């Protein structure tokens, strides 16, 4: 019967995504261009005896441009290109699966120099288990067919097998070997020089003011977006136009991008405030505790917008600028705990009445006091011992140590938080006038600029860095260098 | 072969739900009116270069208007509208999950500016786990096929992919990313300004009295129905017409509304299930303990009506007006516990015997004492540590802390409740005569309103707010502004 078709389209549509659209992942797009550089100019490589590399895996967190980097190859390489998804092989029969990979490559041999792309390969790339559940056997037959066809008998050349997944750890080591997938490319979330070039790709079809050059704005916008990815930048460019045209404006201001950031980080800003003046006053004194403690602690994040207008599932928010770091020390993690506890401390100093509104502040202080002790080794008494924590979605099934150790751990979380708590109480009790100044201004303007904090408290007394040019002081290059090697100068 | 089609329905019935039928949440409407305003006025959005957003997720508690806000989207938009559920994809075989997602996007992209709705996406969008049982195998092949169709090579423009869910936290981060679901919309339960405009939607088909006006009545019913959802207001408006039609009345009275608020909260009201004369003497002393302790405590709820007639799973019944407030303090939770324990206290002062009737009064006190100590930070000995406390339908596997902490918690719950118990025993002995006044009328007149408890106990010695205009007047708007922006002026 005619269920033997590969359901893979030989991509004939001219995709208009060149390699100039794929920014950020600079050293990852170089190793995809060498697939194109080989098929277009084989003389540079065949004079050194270099065979064609067989394939590649594109790994990374989701939303990083490992499908977009495959879209660039379709629109640039002049070879035939076909696409297929990793969950298209299995259907409701026994032969289908293995009889569908065999016609994926028999199609890919009729197109002799072609490149094929398997998206979400972890649907048929799962590691083979023992004699087990009956649905697992059909996945192993489809995988074992895929392994023979990529490296074995009747394995042709000139077929580059690109592949993409975001769970490479569940993959079979028979796929991960060279000869099947010669390169494993990890496309991680880019840094600030990478995000600044992803803004340059997507600010390009917008319409900015007579001011706001698209080059200097991309440096500003990557500063305000720490920790984003290749697709989180794509909404901030997009949804700032949908805010610019909701108010029926002619060109996108800078004030429309910041309302596109805070919508994605925060949530729906509710227009009708509903709180009574005795419970808007409590949220105001609470959000001033996040403001002032974050303002007077070194290693705390810079402040952008304290607002008691309800947003998302909260009654207020703080809008910090998280320092895009890779190594947290012990004192940097304490001043997040001494800041996240800062809201309840300001309630307790002014009112004397703890509330239930600090529930999400305490869950953060809990999880950043267990990960320091169990997961990290920040505690002298437990020791230099690291474990694995169960996540929130993960379910706590059995604790992997003794209850006499868990008695020791919980006695040390309680000392760690109380040391973080007494520091904040001894911080907001001499700055009691400064918390008073912030939250009274919150009860009229209902938001605060960072400039409003400067007009009220003064300059922040710590070595604060906020702009792009003072985040990229260290590398000394000021821009993501898209310089090509000498064998890659056909682009 | 036979199994595999998408079983979707390109709906042809003109849905009579407009955006005016959705109230309470303009901040969620406005980000879904931007999808229809794109499909009616593309020139406004494309003069700034704005692409269409590729979809949106609708999160929230049950009964907040998430399927209704998708019905309104099929109302005004002049495009076809395709509807599937989440659970429609998996059926009994392997591969028929991903083979049915592809046929969904076959029918979707066949219509060019279509809008697609996946109701209850938790059946498919469940997070991809590691190596486990084979039931998670064919679910993740259906999720990965979805993620290829949302953002891949076979991804055309102007196909809006809406979806609604109750459980956001179990969803896959690859599914909730920008590019798959650009907008993340949380529709919470409505506030009091939000609720009065939901009454205006559902007081619209009713035949009320000639005295009652639909604007003043919608404000009154929102003040009498605190904490309700959006689908509760539709039930109070429905059953007040059904109560009015049992009594053969020509028009719906306000008294017919107050019998519908009581029927939804309380349950069925058994008048014929009689008790013994030594049982009614016990139930009346139990319910007078809830009445008098709720009367003389400050932060307790204002009382509406106390009955001794059997209502549902219960011999007595009390009817309270819960204060709509978002920040419970430590005293406002003790006074809710001292009111709930007042039933056992009163039948122990008068009789000496304690019954099994205070079982459900003790399950509320227990759950409100773990929540202060474990989940909030309301305790000194445990510390300011927050844990995810398991619900009633959550079979707990193992505690997230030690055993010497669980010994520390259950000691502090005993100290907490026995301080709430002694505070109520000291209350209903100072007010011992007033409890006897209330229950002797309860044996004569089986219900007591608020007015005939003013006739017994005088006015309540605390300021109590009771009307809409008193619940709202601190803010300064008095209504919910449905003021659409400049670029949305087509509605």
């Amino acid at each position: 019967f005619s269920v033997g078709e590969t359901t893979a389209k030989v991509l004939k549509d001219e995709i208009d995504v060149k390699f100039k659209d794929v920014a950020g992942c600079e050293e990852a797009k170089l190793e995809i261009m060498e697939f194109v550089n080989f098929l277009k100019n084989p003389k540079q490589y065949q004079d050194l005896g270099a065979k064609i590399p067989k394939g590649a895996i594109l790994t990374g967190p989701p939303g990083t441009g490992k499908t977009l980097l495959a879209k660039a190859t379709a629109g640039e390489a002049n070879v035939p290109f076909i696409t297929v998804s990793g969950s298209e092989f299995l259907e409701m029969f026994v032969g289908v699966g293995p009889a569908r990979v065999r016609d994926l490559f028999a199609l890919a041999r009729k197109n002799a120099p072609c490149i094929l792309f398997i998206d979400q390969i972890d649907a048929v790339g799962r590691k083979r288990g023992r004699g087990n559940f009956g649905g697992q056997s059909e996945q192993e037959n489809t995988l074992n067919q895929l392994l023979v066809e990529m490296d074995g008998f009747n394995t042709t050349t000139n077929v580059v097998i690109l592949a993409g997944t975001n769970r490479p750890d569940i993959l079979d080591p028979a796929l991960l070997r060279p000869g099947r997938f010669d390169r494993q490319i990890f496309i991680g979330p880019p840094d600030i020089k990478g995000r600044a070039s992803i803004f340059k790709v997507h600010l390009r079809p917008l319409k900015l003011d007579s001011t706001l050059e698209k080059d200097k704005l991309a440096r500003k916008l990557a500063s305000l977006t720490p920790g984003f990815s290749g697709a989180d930048v794509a909404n901030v460019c997009n949804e700032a136009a949908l805010i610019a045209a909701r108010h029926l404006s002619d060109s996108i201001n800078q004030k429309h991008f910041e309302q596109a950031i805070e919508r994605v980080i925060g949530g729906l800003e509710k227009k009708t405030q509903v709180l009574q003046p005795e419970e808007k006053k409590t949220v105001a004194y609470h959000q001033a505790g996040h403001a002032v403690a974050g303002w007077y602690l070194e290693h705390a994040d810079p402040l952008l917008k304290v607002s008691i207008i309800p947003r998302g599932k909260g009654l207020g928010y703080a809008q910090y600028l998280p320092k895009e770091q890779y190594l947290y020390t012990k004192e940097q993690l304490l001043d997040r705990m001494c800041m996240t506890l800062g809201g309840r401390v300001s309630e307790e100093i002014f009112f004397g009445r703890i509330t239930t509104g600090a529930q999400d502040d305490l869950r953060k202080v809990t999880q950043s006091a267990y990960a320091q002790i169990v997961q990290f080794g920040m505690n002298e008494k437990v020791g230099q011992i690291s474990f694995d924590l169960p996540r929130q979605g993960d379910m706590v099934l059995e604790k992997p140590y003794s209850e006499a150790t868990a008695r020791l751990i919980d006695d040390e979380v309680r000392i760690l938080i109380n040391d973080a708590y007494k520091r904040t109480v001894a911080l907001l009790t001499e700055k009691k006038a400064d918390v008073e100044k912030v939250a009274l201004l919150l009860l009229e303007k209902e938001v605060l600029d960072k400039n409003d904090m400067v007009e009220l408290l003064g300059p922040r007394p710590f070595a604060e860095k906020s702009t792009y040019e003072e985040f990229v002081e260290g590398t000394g290059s000021l821009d993501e260098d898209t310089s090509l090697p000498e064998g890659l100068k056909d682009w | 072969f036979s199994v595999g089609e998408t079983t979707a329905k390109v709906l042809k019935d003109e849905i009579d739900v407009k955006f005016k039928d959705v109230a309470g949440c303009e901040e969620a409407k406005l980000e879904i009116m931007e999808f229809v305003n794109f499909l009616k006025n593309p020139k406004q959005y494309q003069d700034l270069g704005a692409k269409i957003p590729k979809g949106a997720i609708l999160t929230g508690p049950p009964g907040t208007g998430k399927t209704l806000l998708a019905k309104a989207t099929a109302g005004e938009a002049n495009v076809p509208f395709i509807t599937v559920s989440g659970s429609e994809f998996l059926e009994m075989f392997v591969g028929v999950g991903p083979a049915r997602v592809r046929d969904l996007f076959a029918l979707a992209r066949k219509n060019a500016p279509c809008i697609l709705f996946i109701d209850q996406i938790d059946a498919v969008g469940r997070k991809r786990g590691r190596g486990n049982f084979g039931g998670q195998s064919e679910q993740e092949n259906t999720l990965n096929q979805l993620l290829v169709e949302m953002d891949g090579f076979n991804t055309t423009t102007n196909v809006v992919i809406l979806a609604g869910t109750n459980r956001p936290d179990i969803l896959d981060p690859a599914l909730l990313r920008p590019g798959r679901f650009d907008r993340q919309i949380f529709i919470g339960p409505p506030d009091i300004k939000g609720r009065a405009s939901i009454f205006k939607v559902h007081l619209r088909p009713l035949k009320l009295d000639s005295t009652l006006e639909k604007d003043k009545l919608a404000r009154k019913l929102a003040s009498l129905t605190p904490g309700f959802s959006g689908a509760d207001v539709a039930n109070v408006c429905n059953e007040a017409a059904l109560i009015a039609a049992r009594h053969l009345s020509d028009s719906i009275n306000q008294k017919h509304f107050e019998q519908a608020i009581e029927r939804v909260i309380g349950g069925l009201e058994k008048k014929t299930q009689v008790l013994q004369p030594e049982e009614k003497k016990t139930v009346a002393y139990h319910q007078a303990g809830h009445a008098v302790a709720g009367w003389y405590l400050e932060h307790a709820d204002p009382l509406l009506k106390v009955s001794i007639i059997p209502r549902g799973k219960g011999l007595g019944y009390a009817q309270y007006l819960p204060k709509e407030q978002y920040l419970y303090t430590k005293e406002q939770l003790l006074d809710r516990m001292c009111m709930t324990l007042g039933g056992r206290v009163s039948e122990e002062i008068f009789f000496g015997r304690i019954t099994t009737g205070a079982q459900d009064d003790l399950r509320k006190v227990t759950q409100s004492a773990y929540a202060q100590i474990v989940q909030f930070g309301m305790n000194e000995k445990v510390g300011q540590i927050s844990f995810d406390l398991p619900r009633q339908g959550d079979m707990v596997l193992e505690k997230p802390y030690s055993e010497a902490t669980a010994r520390l918690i259950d000691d502090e719950v005993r100290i907490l409740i026995n301080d709430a118990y002694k505070r109520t025993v000291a209350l209903l002995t100072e007010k011992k005569a007033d409890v006897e006044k209330v229950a002797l009328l309860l044996l004569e007149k089986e219900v007591l309103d608020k007015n005939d408890m003013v006739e017994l106990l005088g006015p309540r010695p605390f300021a109590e707010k009771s009307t809409y205009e008193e619940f709202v007047e601190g803010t300064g708007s008095l209504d919910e502004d449905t003021s659409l922006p400049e670029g949305l002026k087509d509605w």
Binding site: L315, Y317, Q319, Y320, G357, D360, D361, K364 | G188
Partner: peptide
Amino acid sequence: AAAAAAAAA
């Protein structure tokens, strides 16, 4: 955490 908050009831 990019932004702290004050949660609901």
